[PDB]
Amino acid sequence: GLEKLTWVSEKKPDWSNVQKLIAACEATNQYTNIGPIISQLESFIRDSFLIEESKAVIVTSNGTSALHALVGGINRQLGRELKFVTQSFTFPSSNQGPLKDSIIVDIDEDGGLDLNAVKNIEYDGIIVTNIHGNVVDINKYVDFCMNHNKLLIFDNAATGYTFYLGKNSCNYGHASIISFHHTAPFGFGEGGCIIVDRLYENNIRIGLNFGLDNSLGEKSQYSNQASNYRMCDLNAAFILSYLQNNYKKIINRHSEIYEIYKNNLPKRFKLFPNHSKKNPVCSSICLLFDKPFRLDKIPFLSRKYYKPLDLSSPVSLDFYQRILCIPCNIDLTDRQIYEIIGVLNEFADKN
Amino acid sequence: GHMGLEKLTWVSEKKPDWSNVQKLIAACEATNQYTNIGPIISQLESFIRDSFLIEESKAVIVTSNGTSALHALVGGINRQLGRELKFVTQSFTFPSSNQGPLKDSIIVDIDEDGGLDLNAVKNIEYDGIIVTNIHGNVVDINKYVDFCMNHNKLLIFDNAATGYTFYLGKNSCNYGHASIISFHHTAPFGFGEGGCIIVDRLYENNIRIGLNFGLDNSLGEKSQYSNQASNYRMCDLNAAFILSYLQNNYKKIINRHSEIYEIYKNNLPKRFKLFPNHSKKNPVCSSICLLFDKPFRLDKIPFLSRKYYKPLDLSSPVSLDFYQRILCIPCNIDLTDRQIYEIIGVLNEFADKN
Numbered sequence: 001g002l003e004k005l006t007w008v009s010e011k012k013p014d015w016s017n018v019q020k021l022i023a024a025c026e027a028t029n030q031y032t033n034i035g036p037i038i039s040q041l042e043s044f045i046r047d048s049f050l051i052e053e054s055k056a057v058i059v060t061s062n063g064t065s066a067l068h069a070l071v072g073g074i075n076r077q078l079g080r081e082l083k084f085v086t087q088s089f090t091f092p093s094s095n096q097g098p099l100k101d102s103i104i105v106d107i108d109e110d111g112g113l114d115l116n117a118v119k120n121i122e123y124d125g126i127i128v129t130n131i132h133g134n135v136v137d138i139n140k141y142v143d144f145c146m147n148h149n150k151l152l153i154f155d156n157a158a159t160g161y162t163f164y165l166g167k168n169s170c171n172y173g174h175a176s177i178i179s180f181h182h183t184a185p186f187g188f189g190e191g192g193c194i195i196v197d198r199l200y201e202n203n204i205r206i207g208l209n210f211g212l213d214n215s216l217g218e219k220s221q222y223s224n225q226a227s228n229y230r231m232c233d234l235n236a237a238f239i240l241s242y243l244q245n246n247y248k249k250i251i252n253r254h255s256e257i258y259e260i261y262k263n264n265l266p267k268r269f270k271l272f273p274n275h276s277k278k279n280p281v282c283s284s285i286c287l288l289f290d291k292p293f294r295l296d297k298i299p300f301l302s303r304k305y306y307k308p309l310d311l312s313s314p315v316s317l318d319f320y321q322r323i324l325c326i327p328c329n330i331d332l333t334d335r336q337i338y339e340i341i342g343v344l345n346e347f348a349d350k351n
Numbered sequence: 352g353h354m355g356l357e358k359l360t361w362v363s364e365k366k367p368d369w370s371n372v373q374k375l376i377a378a379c380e381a382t383n384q385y386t387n388i389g390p391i392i393s394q395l396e397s398f399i400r401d402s403f404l405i406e407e408s409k410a411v412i413v414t415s416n417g418t419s420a421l422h423a424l425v426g427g428i429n430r431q432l433g434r435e436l437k438f439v440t441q442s443f444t445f446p447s448s449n450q451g452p453l454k455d456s457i458i459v460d461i462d463e464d465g466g467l468d469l470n471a472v473k474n475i476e477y478d479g480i481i482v483t484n485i486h487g488n489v490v491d492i493n494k495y496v497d498f499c500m501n502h503n504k505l506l507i508f509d510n511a512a513t514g515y516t517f518y519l520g521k522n523s524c525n526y527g528h529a530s531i532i533s534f535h536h537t538a539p540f541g542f543g544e545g546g547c548i549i550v551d552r553l554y555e556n557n558i559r560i561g562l563n564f565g566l567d568n569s570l571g572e573k574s575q576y577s578n579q580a581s582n583y584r585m586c587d588l589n590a591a592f593i594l595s596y597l598q599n600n601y602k603k604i605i606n607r608h609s610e611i612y613e614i615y616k617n618n619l620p621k622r623f624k625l626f627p628n629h630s631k632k633n634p635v636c637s638s639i640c641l642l643f644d645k646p647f648r649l650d651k652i653p654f655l656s657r658k659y660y661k662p663l664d665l666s667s668p669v670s671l672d673f674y675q676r677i678l679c680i681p682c683n684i685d686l687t688d689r690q691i692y693e694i695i696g697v698l699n700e701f702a703d704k705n
């Protein structure tokens with residue numbers, strides 16, 4: 001039964017629908033530099049993911065370029081290269097591009113950047129990762145950054161539809177980013193999205209286009225903080241089509257998969273720390289064993305994320321050593337989930 | 352009075368060969384591998400090598416866009432050498448070469464041949480230079496090669512707009528340590544977004560793993576991200592649209608762009624010159640770049656036309672002079688010879704009155 005597990009659901013273009021969308025590009029020859037699909041996808045994300053009016057929805061080439069475009073747009077707006085802190089327990093994106101010199105601190109046992117490690121250092125802002133659809137105690141980060149006059153970015157690459165105190169977690173902090181990578185529940189190919197305070201929208205949007213704004217004619221000015229960060233309308237069509245056809249099923253079924261693990265926890269495993277009242281929509285089901293173990297002991301498709309960016313961060317390393325990332329996708333059967341739980345019970349008994 | 356020119360577009364009308372694109376992407380549907388180097392990437396990199404004639408000494412590495420080809424190239428070389436390398440770029444170019452890992456590159460003027468003024472780096476500390484082959488025109492490539500050899504400097508050609516201009520019998524992309532090309536929709540060979548790195552094999556591995564955050568899955572637990580890396584890879588969906596467009600069009604684009612250049616070469620309007628170019632055969636141009644003898648405004652030209660490049664440093668005098676004197680005329684496979692002569696008619700009329 002577990003032989004046919006896949007990391008990602010089988011995804012295939014709805015060709016008739018993708019062709020209908022890109023017909024708009026064919027009619028004007030505008031397939032990028034903000035063609036006719038970008039507004040359609042940004043709208044659909046706003047309305048389907050429930051983003052608030054005080055937030056821009058800005059699609060980009062990938063989750064990484066969503067984070068980098070966000071920072072570059074903010075840097076240009078403030079006339080300074082801002083210094084960010086990120087947690088060790090995250091993907092490389094938050095220590096690359098305009099963040100290549102970001103400060104790396106440990107997480108606390110609740111899965112997010114340890115606020116204790118930024119008490120006595122110089123920084124403009126923090127990046128907190130909501131791990132694989134799970135969310136931190138978001139209001140403790142909002143409150144701290146408010147009291148210290150710091151920018152707050154949520155790395156929601158893997159966290160497009162987990163609700164915190166009645167709204168999409170993407171609506172908290174000054175900004176968040178989402179990934180539409182093929183491996184994300186909502187993704188298809190490559191893509192990213194910035195959810196950000198309107199204060200920064202214009203500088204971020206022109207910052208996808210080297211800083212250039214055609215509407216300014218002769219005073220259009222590049223920024224050395226910008227790049228080519230835009231989403232191509234081809235990619236926007238594939239992602240919008242996948243979302244139109246699947247987004248509601250993904251939300252419901254991922255929540256149901258979470259329910260089975262929550263009510264049938266395997267022996268000596270705990271759910272990854274989460275602070276949502278309703279079940280999170282996960283990119284994988286993250287469990288923590290009570291002690292370090294190797295993946296090669298687990299006899300079905302599984303992974304460990306995230307190898308600490310700084311291998312010296314103790315909680316990050318402990319989590320990495322104890323974590324199991326189980327496939328979570330709309331192809332999973334309840335039968336496969338109960339078989340996985342039975343295998344992990346057996347794993348615990350032998351280990 | 353020129354409704355015959357009302358239909359001019361900057362770019363040829365491009366539409367997917369849906370059957371060809373669907374055939375290519377069926378490889379992705381079979382395995383669910385649409386990115387992270389799916390089954391189309393090797394096919395597009397092979398097609399570019401065989402079609403553009405890239406030597407076996409060079410890796411062909413596709414990327415998300417021409418800007419990411421340049422940035423992934425520099426980020427991979429930075430990782431291999433163990434430091435953030437200092438590049439000089441020319442003011443008369445696109446922003447890409449003063450962004451990302453090049454955000455602090457040194458900017459210098461061009462000489463009147465359209466490339467980086469080598470006399471301007473006399474007393475600078477730098478590791479390499481980036482020279483822009485403007486809109487398919489090439490610089491005296493061997494001048495730059497000899498200089499970078501004598502001075503032990505890395506040489507990158509920004510060929511964003513220059514995928515098939517030959518210098519001494521080989522594609523200009525084959526010269527220096529590396530070049531990059533753009534498959535942006537606005538590029539003759541482009542469709543949507545895309546880029547390509549042509550680079551000495553010495554750097555191939557660091558650049559390829561640098562598309563994937565510096566991670567190498569073949570190292571297992573020793574796989575290690577680099578702060579010099581990013582997400583720079585080309586999505587196989589994009590590879591399929593670009594490959595299909597190249598397969599159907601690249602030979603016609605080379606021949607037709609050469610034919611269009613030939614008409615301008617033999618019917619130059621009064622007081623305009625061809626942008627400087629050092630190839631023996633006609634270049635393959637993203638636009639026909641003419642220099643008027645005097646500064647002028649685009650709003651005097653009664654047909655679709657542009658100016659490139661606004662100088663990155665507006666205190667670069669040769670760069671500003673070119674900008675003020677340049678006219679970038681549409682060059683694509685939809686243009687009729689009849690339209691080109693109506694354009695030259697308009698530009699003689701412009702010249703006599705300015």
Ligand SMILES: Cc1ncc(COP(=O)(O)O)c(/C=N/[C@H]2[C@H](O)[C@@H](O)[C@@H](OP(=O)(O)OP(=O)(O)OC[C@H]3O[C@@H](n4ccc(=O)[nH]c4=O)[C@H](O)[C@@H]3O)O[C@@H]2C)c1O
Pocket residue numbers: 029030031032033035212214228361362416417418419444445447483509511512533534535536537545546659
């Ligand atoms: C020397 C050099 N180096 C690097 C790069 C970076 O490559 P990449 O990252 O691929 O853009 C470039 C890129 N040059 C290109 C760039 O790709 C494109 O956006 C464009 O810039 P820009 O003129 O600012 O873009 P635009 O105003 O939106 O479009 C130019 C014309 O192109 C038309 N166009 C534009 C997009 C489209 O989908 N279809 C289309 O027909 C558009 O209607 C307009 O008529 O031209 C540049 C010369 C370069 O020239």
Ligand SMILES: Cc1ncc(COP(=O)(O)O)c(/C=N/[C@H]2[C@H](O)[C@@H](O)[C@@H](OP(=O)(O)OP(=O)(O)OC[C@H]3O[C@@H](n4ccc(=O)[nH]c4=O)[C@H](O)[C@@H]3O)O[C@@H]2C)c1O
Pocket residue numbers: 007008062063064065090091093129155157158179180181182183191192305382383384385386387389566568582
């Ligand atoms: C916290 C955080 N922040 C930022 C980003 C950056 O977003 P983006 O720039 O979109 O990747 C991310 C991205 N995380 C993702 C990333 O997008 C993806 O490449 C992947 O990384 P990695 O595990 O190194 O890649 P992989 O080894 O190629 O693929 C993981 C699995 O996914 C399967 N896969 C992969 C690609 C595909 O097309 N189809 C497919 O089935 C693949 O077969 C394998 O089983 O997972 C990360 C968790 C993040 O987790």
Ligand SMILES: [Cl-]
Pocket residue numbers: 163164165166275276277278
């Ligand atoms: Cl809640």
Ligand SMILES: [Cl-]
Pocket residue numbers: 012013014241242245246
């Ligand atoms: Cl679908």
Ligand SMILES: [Cl-]
Pocket residue numbers: 517518519520629630631632
């Ligand atoms: Cl030659």
Ligand SMILES: [Cl-]
Pocket residue numbers: 366367368595596599600
């Ligand atoms: Cl075609």
Ligand code: NA
Pocket residue numbers: 599600
């Ligand atoms: Na054809």
